Design a protein around this ligand. Structure first.
Ligand SMILES: OC[C@H]1O[C@@H](O[C@H]2[C@H](O)[C@@H](O)[C@H](O[C@H]3[C@H](O)[C@@H](O)[C@H](O)O[C@@H]3CO)O[C@@H]2CO)[C@H](O)[C@@H](O)[C@@H]1O
Ligand SMILES: [Ca+2]
Length: 769
């Protein structure tokens, strides 16, 4: 490997061999069907709300999130980079697709597949990833840096449906070598959203944009239809000329054929026919190819940028609503703008790289933090783009000031902005994209007094319940299968209108968003204040026995939605205390004296009773009325965790908090698989895992990262990082279970998982407050 010195890959990048087999991979641990796309994954390309494309460590474009809210894992074999090299003096050169695999059928059989093992590495530090190619049959060593412009405090480039592939080529040998790099792409219009005639009318055109000191050559892969539908738009690939490279292209090759129409050209001398051909296809799949060819002398390096864009302006959800995607603000809505997007990227990618470096540098340059922590901190952010992210710029047909936003809990449980989850998972948004965060919270504020008296069957028990109760915060803002933002509470496993955590978490999120954006946004507090008061007042009515605390009802009535709580729980009780303290402080800021007094009075009574009921001398009991009331819960002091972040002080005595956290580390971490797998949710005081429910026997990745943050704030530095380390290890390490770029909600002691591609572990960003 002589190419690594010519590029700049951070030491904290996650690494794997191209073509590496992983032996230890985990699988779902539930009895119902659940997504398992394998460990062949990579960092995604694409902006927020753009639809994303997962290119894996083997080189394939395989995890398709272009249909917003859906996860489709299938390798589109035509989509590749390929290389040709010929040493000056030799009769023939060699050509190789840069993909460690081959197609399942006979399409593209002429291409040279099966990029060999031990011949290159993949690296990722989101939003960047890299591949190096160090192959004994390729005298010139190559590397590519690929990324999308995901940039904190930037809501423009961050939305773009574009990727840059910045290639570096170096000749360490003593002979001249002719080199070509070719990008191939299938015209994917009709890949989704088209019920019949899936390729019909697809056509490819070539754009040559020549001005002084800029030449771009691009293929635009579209359809003859000017219809404005979810399926229609354009893909583009292209390259920018640099000194010493020539560009060649082929507008149309057949993807549903042997591929020799293209490959016979490329494999000969690395130069394509430059054949334009706009003839639309009927049944056959078609694609385009863009190549560069150059000669490298001994010791010479060259850099050349390619790009990919996709202009698919309309997202459709299963309930029938069609919305424009956010990026259409910047490029238009007609779906004929892929070239404009591509050109912006090719002309500005160097600036974007520097903007990315500028945001990563403060963390990367901090030599007190271990590399593994940096690996996790950056790579967990993949989910902000990959989580079915929806970001609208108008309903099709029907303008507003604001752009509604939603991130899925996950794909298996297809619910937008699940509030009990975002309490953990929304830290990157408040810290890095706060205008999105505040918009999402205003979305929740607007739902508080919505009433929907229609009934649904509760999954856990079969009982009928009212969809949405006035004054109760919704579980979620809908499903991609139905009507995001319009029909809330798509979740039906339990009835969220009787949950004891949603209303408190809502208030805590509101105050969090004020505190972590500088305690200056009084208008945000004003917008949400009525809903905050309503939320707390409604939750107070669920206090059955006048101890000042809402009563859990002996069913799962909170985020641990198969784990029953009864009476006063440490979890919901602490959240309630913290929410009351936050509302007191908002009351002070907004000069609402009567609210301050009321919530101060409720807080004092509740605090006193919480302590009496639950403090056992070593930790806080799980609850007051369950069979396993004395279980040690990892998340027992969640309210105090948020209180630390919100600077609300001691809701519980410092001594007791420290004892409880030490107990959790000693038991839930260190007595669970030697502390190498995170914090198990429930442990009995005899040191055996609580078996009352499956969720007690799970480590929740987001709960564990949040607990690490809590320990860190409380000065338990070793415990904090050791606790978080087990989550990193299981996700990323060779000794783990292969969950990179699909971090699950949970795993059991065997390492097998529940709900890959999950929002909650974005809580690792709470470790940076
Ligand atoms: O909907 C999201 C929630 O799902 C919970 O899992 C439940 C599944 O949604 C549900 O389909 C499954 O159904 C069981 C059924 O209860 C049982 O009687 C039958 O024999 O088998 C079905 C599965 O084939 O139940 C599970 C719970 O066990 C998650 O647990 C929850 O966290 C999530 O939010
Ligand atoms: Ca009570």
């Amino acid at each position: 490997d002589k190419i690594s010195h010519k590029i700049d890959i951070p030491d904290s990048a996650w690494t794997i061999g191209i073509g590496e087999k992983f032996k230890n991979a985990g699988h779902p641990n539930v009895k119902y069907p659940m997504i398992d796309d394998s460990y062949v994954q990579g960092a995604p390309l694409g902006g927020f709300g753009a639809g994303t494309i997962g290119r894996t460590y083997n080189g394939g474009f395989s995890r398709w999130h272009l249909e917003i809210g859906k996860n489709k894992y299938t390798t589109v074999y035509a989509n590749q980079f390929s290389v040709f090299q010929k040493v000056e003096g030799n009769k023939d050169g060699v050509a190789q697709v840069l993909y460690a695999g081959e197609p399942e059928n006979g399409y593209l059989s002429s291409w040279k597949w099966d990029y060999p093992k031990e011949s290159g590495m993949y690296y990722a530090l989101y939003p960047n990833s890299w591949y190096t190619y160090t192959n004994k049959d390729l005298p010139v060593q190559l590397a590519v840096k690929q990324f999308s412009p995901i940039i904190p405090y930037n809501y423009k480039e961050t939305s773009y449906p574009v990727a840059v592939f910045k290639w570096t080529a170096y000749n360490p040998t003593n002979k001249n070598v002719d080199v070509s790099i070719m990008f191939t792409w299938q015209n994917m219009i009709g890949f989704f959203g088209k019920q019949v005639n899936v390729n019909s009318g697809n056509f490819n055109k070539i754009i040559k944009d020549k001005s002084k000191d800029s030449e771009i050559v691009a293929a635009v892969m579209g359809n003859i239809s000017n219809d404005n539908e979810e399926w229609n738009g354009e893909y583009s690939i292209g390259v920018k000329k640099v000194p010493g490279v020539d560009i060649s292209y082929k507008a149309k090759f057949v993807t549903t054929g042997d591929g020799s129409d293209l490959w016979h050209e490329f494999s000969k001398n690395g130069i394509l026919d430059n054949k334009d051909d706009e003839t639309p296809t009927k049944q056959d799949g078609i694609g385009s190819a863009i190549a560069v060819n150059f000669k490298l002398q001994p010791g010479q390096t060259i850099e050349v940028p390619f790009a990919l864009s996709w202009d698919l302006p309309i997202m459709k959800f299963g309930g029938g609503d069609k919305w424009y995607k956010m990026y259409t603000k910047y490029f238009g809505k007609n779906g004929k703008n892929s070239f404009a997007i591509l050109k912006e990227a090719l002309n500005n990618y160097q600036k974007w790289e520097k903007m990315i470096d500028d945001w990563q540098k403060p963390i990367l340059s901090n030599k007190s933090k271990p590399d593994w922590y940096k690996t996790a901190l950056f790579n967990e952010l993949y989910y902000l783009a990959d989580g079915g992210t929806a970001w609208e710029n108008g309903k099709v047909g029907e303008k507003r000031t604001n752009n509604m936003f939603g991130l899925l809990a996950c794909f298996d449980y297809n619910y937008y902005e699940t509030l009990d989850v975002r309490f953990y998972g929304s830290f990157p948004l408040v810290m890095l994209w706060p205008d999105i965060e505040k918009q999402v919270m205003r979305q929740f504020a607007d739902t508080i007094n919505v009433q929907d008296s229609s009934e649904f069957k509760v999954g856990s028990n079969g009982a009928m319940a009212v969809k949405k109760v006035q004054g109760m915060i919704p579980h979620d803002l809908g499903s991609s299968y139905a009507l995001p933002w319009i029909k809330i509470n798509a979740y039906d496993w339990q009835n969220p209108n009787i949950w004891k955590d949603l209303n408190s978490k809502y208030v805590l999120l509101v105050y969090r968003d004020y505190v972590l954006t500088g305690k200056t946004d009084k208008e945000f507090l004003k917008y949400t204040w009525k809903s905050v008061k309503t939320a707390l007042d409604k939750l107070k009515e669920m206090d059955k026995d006048n101890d000042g605390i809402p009563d859990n009802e002996g069913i799962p009535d909170q985020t641990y939605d198969t784990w029953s709580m009864k009476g006063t729980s440490a979890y919901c009780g602490s959240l309630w205390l913290a929410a009351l303290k936050a509302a007191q402080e908002i009351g002070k800021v907004l000069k609402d004296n009567e609210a301050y007094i009321k919530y101060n009075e409720w807080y004092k009574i509740a605090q006193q009773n919480f302590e009496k009921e639950l403090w056992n001398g070593e930790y806080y009991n799980f609850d007051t009325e369950s069979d396993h009331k004395d279980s040690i819960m990892a998340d027992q002091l969640a309210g105090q965790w948020y209180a630390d972040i919100l600077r609300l002080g001691d809701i519980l005595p410092k001594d007791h908090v420290q004892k409880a956290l030490k107990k959790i580390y000693e038991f839930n971490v260190m007595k669970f698989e030697n502390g190498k797998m995170g914090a198990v949710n429930g442990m009995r005081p005899d040191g055996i895992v609580d078996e009352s429910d499956i969720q007690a026997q799970e480590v929740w990745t987001g709960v564990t990262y949040a607990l690490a943050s809590f320990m860190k704030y409380r000065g338990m530095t070793e415990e904090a990082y050791n606790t978080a380390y087990g989550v990193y290890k299981m996700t990323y390490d060779k000794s783990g279970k292969g969950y990179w770029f699909r971090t699950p909600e949970a795993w059991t002691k065997d390492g097998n998982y529940r709900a890959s591609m999950y929002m909650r572990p974005l809580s690792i960003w709470s470790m940076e407050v």
